[PDB]
Amino acid sequence: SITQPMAETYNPSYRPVNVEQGQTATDKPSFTTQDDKDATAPTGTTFTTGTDTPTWATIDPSNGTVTLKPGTPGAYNVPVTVTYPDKSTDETTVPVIVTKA
């Protein structure tokens, strides 16, 4: 705590994703610094979905890539917890718009 948490330094986000009902899509996270400079998250950062996730969103905890296999049309924020190697955490979202075929 003379050093600062990694969660202060890094800012995760996901791309907005449309996915058609009955189709598959993917989304992956990107990071910025506190100036919206592109950043490489610390090596060993992990990713999990929160408990309120839609059941058709699966995550690869090694890199945060999210596979989406909906599901009822609508708008959904998939909750993702980013755990940095220093055990600090960010919360972010996978913003998904599911459209009808």
Q: The tokens 């994703």 sit on which residue?
A: 17
Nearest-CB residue to Na ion? 90
Smallest distance from the beta carbon of 12 to Na ion, in angstroms? 7
Segment contacting Na ion by CB under 5 A, of 7-15, 42-50, 58-66, 92-100: 7-15
Among 53, 78, 90, 94, binds Na ion (CB under 5 A): 90
Q: How many residues line the site for Na ion (CB under 5 A)?
A: 3
Smallest distance from the beta carbon of 55 to Na ion, in angstroms? 27
25 binds Na ion (CB under 5 A): no
Bridge partners (DSSP) of residue 77 are: 95
Which residue number, 17 or 39, has a Cβ lying nearer to Na ion? 39
Q: The tokens 């690869």 sit on which residue?
A: 60
Residue 98: other Cβ atoms inside 10 A: 22
7 binds Na ion (CB under 5 A): yes
Sites of contact with Na ion (CB under 5 A):
7, 11, 90
